[PDB]
Design a protein around this ligand. Structure first.
Ligand SMILES: [Zn+2]
Length: 436
């Protein structure tokens, strides 16, 4: 019941109301138990609560399998801080403590409401008697697979144990299963659905990556005579939306190369807008100084490399195409963190695209040399291809981002490069074709 889950959420996690409505629906679906559940919510979006609360309110016990020992310990400690009866069965646990946890499990009603487990030892022969004892007694109310993307090779991070967890789902079938992930491409979604042996009916419960307060546009460097002047104008316009407000908030600028990024920062400083460079090339003390300046209002817009949060960000500009489409989305997510509208820009270049594709080729060659994973090797270049295709698409850029993440394509009434003055973006694309 809705009232029961509401009261349980307030009593356990001290949460008066769910942070998101979609996560509330996901929690309803999981506690219902009629069908398996999937969730793709970004870190810090309450994805944990979706699987924690049903376990709290479940008549049995919920097994939560997570790839890292540290992650398991962090979740268990977080729930213990909430006075929740949780256990952590892992190799890190001692023999006596492990036996005590097993004794707790063997009780008629297991003392540990939520049992976290590391997948590698979950396949261990020692755990299997406990696992099938749990299965026979029908005490396993739910199963949870955190970091579900690890099962898919196409995912950024992969775990073969997560391929095995299809077997664990085959076991304990009576218990509904909840797969959880931070970001999941539709390829990743299908890999998770087929590998974990999840039930035929599943609710994806993925938060729409689209944010109404975002403005995605991809200007062409070759099209603009002085792209640095264009970035100066974009920074000036985005820093202030209210004439009385004037310059406010702060933006971010991303660089493909650390060394050229310092030159970029100094020449934007001379442009009239003060900025600082953040990259490995810069000394650590200076890196911290520029980070602090960005966190404060001292620097209107900061300049950083591809590698790195603020309460409110005015804009996130990408002087060069990001290494991966998901990487570009993550970097642009910093923009529009607050409710105030924010603008995200990407400065394409055919030469820059060739350079980035060469970098991706070197990366995939290194993967083949060491990783030896053809699927992920093709996945990286597929992400780069998706980013570029998003770049040269005479369509809603939010729609393309949603397609890459697989969520239903948003429709931007306004505030999107294509959704307003689309013909202008198409003319820019035609000029790009004319140039190359
Ligand atoms: Zn749009």
């Amino acid at each position: 019941p809705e009232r029961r889950v509401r009261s349980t959420l307030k009593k356990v996690f001290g949460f008066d109301s769910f942070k998101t409505p979609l996560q509330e629906s996901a929690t309803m679906a999981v506690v219902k138990g009629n069908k398996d559940v999937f969730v793709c919510m970004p870190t810090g979006a309450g994805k944990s609560l979706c699987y924690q609360l049903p376990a709290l309110l479940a008549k049995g016990i919920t097994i939560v399998v997570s790839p890292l020992i540290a992650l398991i310990q962090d979740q268990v400690d977080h729930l213990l801080t909430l006075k929740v009866r949780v256990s952590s069965l892992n190799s890190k646990l001692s023999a006596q403590e492990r036996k005590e946890l097993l004794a707790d499990l063997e009780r008629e009603k297991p003392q540990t409401k939520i049992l976290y487990i590391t997948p590698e030892m979950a396949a261990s022969s020692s755990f299997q008697p406990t696992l099938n004892s749990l299965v026979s007694r029908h005490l396993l109310s739910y199963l949870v697979v955190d970091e579900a993307h690890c099962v898919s090779q196409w995912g950024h991070d992969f775990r073969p144990d997560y391929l095995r967890l299809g077997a664990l789902r085959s076991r304990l079938g009576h218990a509904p299963c909840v797969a959880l992930t931070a970001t999941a491409t539709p390829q990743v979604q299908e890999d998770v659905f087929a590998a974990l042996h999840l039930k035929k009916p599943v609710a994806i419960f993925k938060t729409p990556c689209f944010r109404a307060n975002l403005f995605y546009d991809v200007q062409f460097k070759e099209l603009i005579s002085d792209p640095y002047g264009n970035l100066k104008d974009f920074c000036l316009k985005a820093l202030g939306q209210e004439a009385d407000k004037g310059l406010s908030g702060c933006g971010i600028v991303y660089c493909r190369t650390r060394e050229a990024c310092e030159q970029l920062a100094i020449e934007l400083s001379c442009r009239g807008v003060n900025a600082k460079a953040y990259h490995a090339g810069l000394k650590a003390s200076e890196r911290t100084l520029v980070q602090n300046d960005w966190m404060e209002e001292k620097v209107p817009v900061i300049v950083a490399t591809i590698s790195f949060d603020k309460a409110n960000v005015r804009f996130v500009a990408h002087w060069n195409i990001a290494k991966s489409m998901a990487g570009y989305y993550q970097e642009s997510g910093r923009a529009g963190r607050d409710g105030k509208p924010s603008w995200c820009r990407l400065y394409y270049s055919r030469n820059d695209r060739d350079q980035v594709s060469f970098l991706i080729r070197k990366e995939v060659a290194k993967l083949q040399e060491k990783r030896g994973n053809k699927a992920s090797d093709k996945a990286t270049i597929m992400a780069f291809d998706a980013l570029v295709t998003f770049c040269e698409e005479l369509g809603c850029r939010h729609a393309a981002i949603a397609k890459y993440f697989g969520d239903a394509l948003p429709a931007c009434a306004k505030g999107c490069d294509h959704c307003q003055n689309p013909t202008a973006v198409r003319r820019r694309l035609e000029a790009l074709e004319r140039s190359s």
